[PDB]
Design a protein around this nucleic acid. Structure first.
Ligand SMILES: O=C1Nc2ccc(Cl)cc2[C@@](C#CC2CC2)(C(F)(F)F)O1
Ligand SMILES: [Ca+2]
Ligand SMILES: [Ca+2]
Lengths: 410, 540
DNA sequence: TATGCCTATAGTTATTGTGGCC
RNA sequence: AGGCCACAAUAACUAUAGGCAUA
């Protein structure tokens, strides 16, 4: 056991519970009754003012319902414990590997007891249909999934169990974040699956219990300009408008010679031939887009931001940055192929994929800027959600210029 | 053995040390007789100079409640009669000895101390403190419900076929069993409550099926609100309109066709309690028809878990939508009046989707499942809008229904420039000093026109320029502008009173066959745009 | 950098009213 | 020596993100 205290000045988490479906509530009651008998959670009265949101998700391997508790609010109030007092070290060599496999070890925290005085802050309420019943109340007696302090306390017992694995393979890198474990290796396809099982069989020695990543294949695709045989006034006007906006991102871009092609009032269909200066300016502008831009560096003191744009026809583009117009990582997530996909599902699959990439390279979850309404997102996001983490998100407007620029990306 | 709940105070303050008000003698003689009975029963106990804390008796716990710790919500959202299930027999139970049966935390009992006024000029007096839950206390309804939930648990498990709902002190019990079997099970519930010391009315003292709860008159098969009667003709004042809106919003849950926007437009004015705001012809028009809706009595239907939920949307007017949710035709469960154009403008398709999203969330709270929608919009229009729009959304199940006021997308701009069409370079400039602006256009053919305006901004002058570009042009038109604002509005479909100019441009674009609109960066030296800018900013 | 004027996303504290309650 | 709950309207503070105009 270990004493845990809040950040001085701030009180415990007091968040309103979001309404859930009749099927989801009944599923949560079944799980909470099982955990109550096991000694994981206990019923508490109305004297506890603190509350934490609870949602129901579904898994693929287990195929059954999983309980997800949104500790986003509480994690901001207990940030000094798991970052300053007991911080998890992050290496800069995990981002360079041939194959990376992710495993869930969330059931490991369901054994180590929680601090008595801190048990009251992990309280959560199960909502009722049309508020017929007052609402069932529970609090965690052990380390909960989704709380940042859980891997911080288990860290002292996690390093000792991974020591026989680290001494066996010195060149293989391992990293722990939240309830997920990240293992990277430079081994072959048949070799990778066997070596992961060697660590998986080691987990059973302690007692606790198509998903494969390629971090070397995350190479940034450059923005390519339209290769046209014959240019019209309308083709230049659309190009100049996009390139002038892109000048604040790439300082080398100039539109001076392209603007001199338009002299006086002209029709949009009017065919403008490109001169010696116009061709040489455009060709050099293509070279700046291919080669990475200077002045882009990661800063640990600043928060990470991720913005996603809807392009239509099953195409989504995204940018990862700390400061505006200075992107560290760009690309486009088109679609999960064929079957059944909507605007929410394609966005949900993108957010989870961007978050996973952020943990491998940096080890921090980015602030998500979503082109969706708050009420629309908060209702349907739980249906296609699988991961235990919860990224901090905001809902904003998408400009027309940023949408038309990142579609030229290959 | 009614298990005491541990209660503490707020971190940095002791109990109330507020002194008593001047003695009356007329009320003191009566208070002694009541307090002695409460002491004899075991509700309160005598104390001396021990207790420093005091509470005034009228007992007003206004100062203590602010010092008492925060308790989690008893019941935030109230149950809607539409979400309840249809039952054969229903029974209500008014619990006597409610707060008296449940004892208070022994350590907290000293903060509930109250002193009786003296007989003759500040004489020693008699002091008491609550041993049980007091009336008008912050944690009294919270602990009482928590204690009641633990008592009902064994009965709920033994009888899952029956449904018991708890509200404050009253208990609502309903089942699908016969009147003979139902009456027997209520007595078995009473004997279980009597074990803990909870007084409940007998068979003859029980209330009949017409229950009055939260303004609703409840029945086993249907539900209805109390008849709404309002003061009428003569010129009413400002807050009387606010009282009228409060009644119409209250009636909106059952009465489908309710229009309240014109009364809200009259309340857009500020201040005086007796302004005596007169009516406009359009305001009294929707008020007179709302009187006709409230004439014929209507009723609501209960929820059946077997049948699917069906919701229907109708566009009644400008920024106004009405919905009725039903499982069986003509048998409505709950209606609404969604008209939340939040002082903005928006459109028709997105505003319909914002209506759908509110009902979807409403159905999760009330019934616990998503309803099937029947919208007044075609699948051809829905797909065209949401593919070109940046914002993502999803409606899983919806169908098309033809209603007299259909939702119609007016116009679509061309994706590519039009051949043979006259090119119109357009620009507008204005200064906030004196508020003077100019709007003009320059064509590739040679023709041009510049005008001057009064009381205008840069956003208005650029919008006026395109109006002139559509006024003097033919059918196929190519328009070029340097504003992201002017481009953004026309690319959307503003269905509102976005002031005069916008409605004229929309009306102009319907008349035209094909229109292409493009954007260029300002002050970049682009041919065409440079010539217009010099003309509009000549005196600015 | 400031203020006025546009778009979009998201909220907060007060009043008044309707329906209820202590 | 009115408060609490649900919904609605009015008012006020709006905050964030992007943009235009002038300075
Ligand atoms: O499921 C419902 N069905 C129902 C139908 C009619 C009536 Cl009058 C009452 C109910 C009930 C509820 C009630 C609480 C709202 C007051 C009952 F409390 F159990 F009665 O339960
Ligand atoms: Ca009130
Ligand atoms: Ca700004």
């Amino acid at each position: 056991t270990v004493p845990v205290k809040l950040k001085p000045g701030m009180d415990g988490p007091k968040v309103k519970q979001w309404p859930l479906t009749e099927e989801k509530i009944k599923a949560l009651v079944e799980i909470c009754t099982e955990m109550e008998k096991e000694g994981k959670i206990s019923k508490i009265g109305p004297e506890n003012p603190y509350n934490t949101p609870v949602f129901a998700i579904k898994k693929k391997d287990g195929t059954k319902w999983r309980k997800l508790v949104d500790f986003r609010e509480l994690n901001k109030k207990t940030q000094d414990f798991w970052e300053v007092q007991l911080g998890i070290p992050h290496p800069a060599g995990l981002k360079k590997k041939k194959s990376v496999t992710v495993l869930d070890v969330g059931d490991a925290y369901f054994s180590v007891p929680l601090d008595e005085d801190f048990r009251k802050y992990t309280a959560f309420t199960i909502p009722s249909i049309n508020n017929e019943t007052p609402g069932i109340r529970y609090q965690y007696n052990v380390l909960p999934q989704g709380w940042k302090g859980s891997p911080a306390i288990f860290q002292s017992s996690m390093t000792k169990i991974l020591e026989p694995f680290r001494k066996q393979n010195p060149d293989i890198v391992i990293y722990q974040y939240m309830d997920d474990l990240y293992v990277g290796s430079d081994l072959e396809i048949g070799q990778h699956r066997t070596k992961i099982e060697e660590l998986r069989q080691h987990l059973l020695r302690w007692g606790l219990t198509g998903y494969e990543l390629h971090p070397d294949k995350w190479t940034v695709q450059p923005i390519v300009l339209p290769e046209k045989d014959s240019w019209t006034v309308n083709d230049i006007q659309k190009l100049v408008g996009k390139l002038n906006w892109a000048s604040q991102i790439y300082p080398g871009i100039k539109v001076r010679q392209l603007c001199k092609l338009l002299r006086g009032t002209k029709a949009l269909t009017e065919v403008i031939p490109l001169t010696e200066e116009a061709e040489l300016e455009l060709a050099e502008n293509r070279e700046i887009l291919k080669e990475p831009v200077h002045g882009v560096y990661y800063d640990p003191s600043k928060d990470l931001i991720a913005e996603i744009q809807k392009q239509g026809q099953g195409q989504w583009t995204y940018q990862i940055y700390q400061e505006p117009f200075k992107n560290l990582k760009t690309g486009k997530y088109a679609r999960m192929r064929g079957a059944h996909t909507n605007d929410v599902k394609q966005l949900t699959e993108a957010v989870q994929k961007i978050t996973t990439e952020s943990i491998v390279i940096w080890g921090k979850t980015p602030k998500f800027k979503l082109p969706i309404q708050k009420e629309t997102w908060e209702t349907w996001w739980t249906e296609y959600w699988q991961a235990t983490w919860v990224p901090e998100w905001e809902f904003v407007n998408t400009p027309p210029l940023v949408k038309l620029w990142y579609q030229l990306e290959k | 053995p009614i298990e005491t709940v541990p209660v503490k105070l707020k971190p940095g303050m002791d109990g109330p040390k507020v002194k008593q008000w001047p003695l009356t003698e007329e009320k003191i003689k009566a208070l002694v007789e009541i307090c002695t009975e409460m002491e004899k029963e075991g509700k309160i106990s005598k104390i001396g100079p021990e207790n420093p804390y005091n509470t005034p008796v009228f007992v007003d716990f206004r100062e203590l409640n602010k010092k008492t710790q925060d308790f989690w919500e008893v019941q935030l959202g109230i149950p809607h009669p539409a979400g309840l299930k249809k039952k054969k027999s229903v029974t209500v139970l008014d619990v006597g000895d409610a707060y008296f049966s449940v004892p208070l935390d022994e350590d907290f009992r000293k903060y509930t101390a109250f002193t009786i006024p003296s007989i003759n000029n500040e004489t020693p007096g008699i002091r008491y403190q609550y041993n049980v839950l007091p009336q008008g206390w912050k944690g009294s309804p919270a602990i009482f419900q928590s204690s009641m939930t633990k008592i009902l648990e064994p009965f709920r498990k033994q009888n899952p076929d029956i449904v018991i709902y708890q509200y404050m002190d009253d208990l609502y019990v309903g089942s699908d069993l016969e009147i003979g079997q139902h009456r027997t099970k209520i007595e078995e519930l009473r004997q279980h409550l009597l074990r803990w010391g909870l007084t409940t009315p007998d068979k003859k003292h029980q209330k009949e099926p017409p229950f009055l709860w939260m303004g609703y008159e409840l029945h086993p098969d249907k539900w209805t609100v109390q008849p709404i009667v309002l003061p009428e003709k003569d010129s009413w004042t400002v807050n009387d309109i606010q009282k009228l809106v409060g009644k119409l919003n209250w009636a909106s849950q059952i009465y489908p066709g309710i229009k309240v926007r014109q009364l809200c437009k009259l309340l857009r004015g500020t201040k005086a309690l007796t302004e005596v705001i007169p009516l406009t012809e359009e305001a009294e028009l929707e008020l007179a028809e709302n009187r006709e809706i409230l004439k014929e009595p209507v009723h609501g239907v209960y929820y059946d878990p077997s049948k699917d939920l069906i919701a229907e949307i109708q566009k009644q007017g400008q920024g106004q939508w009405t919905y009725q949710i039903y499982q069986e035709p003509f048998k409505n469960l709950k209606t609404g009046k969604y008209a939340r154009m939040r002082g903005a403008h928006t459109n028709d398709v997105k505003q319909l989707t914002e209506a759908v999203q509110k009902i979807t969330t409403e159905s999760i709270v009330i019934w616990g499942k998503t309803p099937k929608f029947k919208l007044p919009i075609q699948k051809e229009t829905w797909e065209t809008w949401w593919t070109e729009y940046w914002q993502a959304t999803w409606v899983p199940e919806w169908e098309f229904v033809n209603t007299p006021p259909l939702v119609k997308l007016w116009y679509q701009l061309e994706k590519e420039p039009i051949v043979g069409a006259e090119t119109f370079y357009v620009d507008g400039a204005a200064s906030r000093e004196t508020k003077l602006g100019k709007a003009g256009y320059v064509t590739n053919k040679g023709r041009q026109k510049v005008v001057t305006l009064t009381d205008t901004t840069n956003q208005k002058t650029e919008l006026q320029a395109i109006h002139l570009a559509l006024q003097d042009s033919g059918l196929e038109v190519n328009i070029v502008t340097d504003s992201q604002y002017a481009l953004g509005i026309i690319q959307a479909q503003p269905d509102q009173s976005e002031s005069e100019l916008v409605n004229q441009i929309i009306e102009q674009l319907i008349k035209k066959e094909k229109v292409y609109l493009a954007w260029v960066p300002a002050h970049k030296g682009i041919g065409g745009n440079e010539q217009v800018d010099k003309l509009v900013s000549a005196g600015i």
